[PDB]
Design a protein around this ligand. Structure first.
Ligand SMILES: [Ca+2]
Length: 462
């Protein structure tokens, strides 16, 4: 159960990997990799921090019999056979290698922490007797079967991926406080109802539609179900200790179950089917609210959310952005891809650092002029259609497009051979045309944020 050298031996004949030898030379207090070391020298090494060293082999590590902690994360390891007898090991950090075979860990029963995420592990049967584990991190592997976890009843933190469908091996792991099952193939989370000490559940990018198992998990303070197939979230009414909730990328329309979750400070509901946010009006502790990619038109319920610093509303059908004027603390406001044609209500949101409002109907930047704390800005690709007008071989309309300074922005292009003499855009149309149009395109900076303010304007002809 111990590898030893019988005579003093050069470091580079024990640690055959170039990078590891160089590291061990420093650890062992030698001045060259050809210098000899004794077994006594080797016996004094109890921890090894050898992360991000370009190590391809840990050959030699078997002679460090007294190791209790190792970090070989972010290397190029495949074979970990040298660990097989290092039974004093308590903690291993070995994420971000190319390890597939973890059979060498099977007898390391004093392990309490094991980090193996970002490897090429499928078979975790070697973990089954590591019952003193309190932390096990296996995300971003190719695990499809977690049967081996079923006896790891001291686990407090667990993550794994990326093939799992059957979570039933978790049933007896009631010591679990933090679980991350992101990026698996799970639909059935019934077993989670047994994990009543869970405080944090991250279950993103799965196939979950039924969350009724969560009903009794009232110790949850953090929950993420981003990227599933949720619609009915009635169960969440029970989870009154939630402070951070992510339900983005689902099919939710009815937010009433959230209305009593008044300890929420962060609520992420992007990419759902929400047309009404009245149930959020009482959630006044919210600082971060995401409502992008929904069916919103009216947003007046945000008016009471006075502590909002961050707000997303992009990809809705909002005409009236003005409720955001109630949010003095607002720092980031994204509402690109809406129908907003007036930003006058933003003029006093002096704390805004990030304003992103492309793909609206904005023609006049002057209300933004005193937003000098802006450091990121987006104003691309406005588009709108004027009220119809009566054809006319000779047709003329005024330019309304204003930069942040108040200056008119000259058209960049004009359709149907049309021309510009400030402020008039003038066409000569041989015969009847159903529409004419023009574009503008103006780089602009406010504060330190730079963008191009641009658009395409369509003029119907009757
Ligand atoms: Ca927070």
């Amino acid at each position: 159960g111990s590898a030893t050298i019988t005579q003093d031996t050069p470091i580079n004949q024990i640690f055959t990997d170039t990078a590891l030898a160089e590291k061990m030379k420093t650890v062992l207090g030698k001045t060259n990799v050809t210098d000899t070391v004794s077994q006594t020298d080797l016996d004094q090494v109890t921890t090894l921090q050898a992360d991000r060293l370009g190590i391809k082999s840990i050959d030699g590590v078997e002679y460090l019999n007294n190791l209790t902690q190792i970090n070989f994360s972010n290397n190029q390891l495949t074979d970990i056979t040298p660990l097989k007898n290092l039974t004093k090991l308590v903690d291993i950090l070995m994420n971000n290698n190319q390890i597939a075979d973890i059979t060498p860990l099977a007898n390391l029963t004093n392990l309490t922490g094991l980090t193996l995420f970002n490897n090429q592990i499928t078979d975790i049967d070697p973990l089954k007797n590591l019952t003193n584990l309190n932390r096990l991190e296996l995300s971003s592997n190719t695990i499809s079967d977690i049967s081996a976890l079923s006896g790891l009843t001291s686990l407090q933190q667990l993550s794994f991926g990326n093939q799992v469908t059957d979570l039933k091996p978790l049933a007896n792991l009631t010591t679990l406080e933090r679980l991350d099952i992101s990026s698996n193939k799970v639909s059935d989370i019934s077993v989670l109802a047994k994990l009543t000490n869970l405080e944090s559940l991250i279950a993103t990018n799965n196939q979950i539609s039924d969350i009724t198992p969560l009903g009794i998990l009232t110790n949850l303070d953090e929950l993420s179900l981003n990227g599933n197939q949720l619609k009915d979230i009635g169960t969440l009414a029970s989870l009154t200790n939630l402070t951070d909730l992510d339900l983005a990328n689902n099919q939710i329309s009815n937010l009433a179950p959230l209305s009593g979750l008044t300890k929420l400070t962060e609520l992420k509901l992007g990419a759902n089917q929400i047309s009404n946010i009245s149930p959020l009006a009482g959630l006044t502790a919210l600082t971060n609210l995401e409502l992008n990619e929904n069916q919103l038109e009216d947003i007046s319920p945000i008016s009471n959310l006075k502590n909002l610093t961050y707000l997303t509303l992009y990809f809705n059908n909002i005409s009236d952005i003005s409720p955001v004027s109630s949010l003095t603390k607002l720092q980031r406001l994204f509402f690109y891809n809406n129908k907003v044609s007036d930003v006058s209500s933003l003029a006093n949101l002096t704390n805004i650092n990030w304003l992103s409002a492309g793909h609206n109907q904005i023609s006049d930047l002057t209300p933004l002029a005193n937003l000098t704390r802006i450091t990121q800005l987006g104003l691309n690709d406005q588009a709108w259609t004027n009220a119809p007008v009566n054809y006319k071989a000779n047709v003329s309309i005024p330019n309304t497009v204003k930069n942040v300074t108040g200056a008119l922005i000259a058209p960049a292009t004009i359709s149907d051979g049309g021309s510009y003499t400030e402020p008039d855009i003038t066409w000569n149309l041989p015969s009847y045309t159903n529409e004419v149009s023009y574009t503008f395109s103006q780089p602009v900076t406010i504060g330190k944020g730079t963008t191009t303010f641009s658009g395409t304007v369509t003029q119907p002809l009757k």
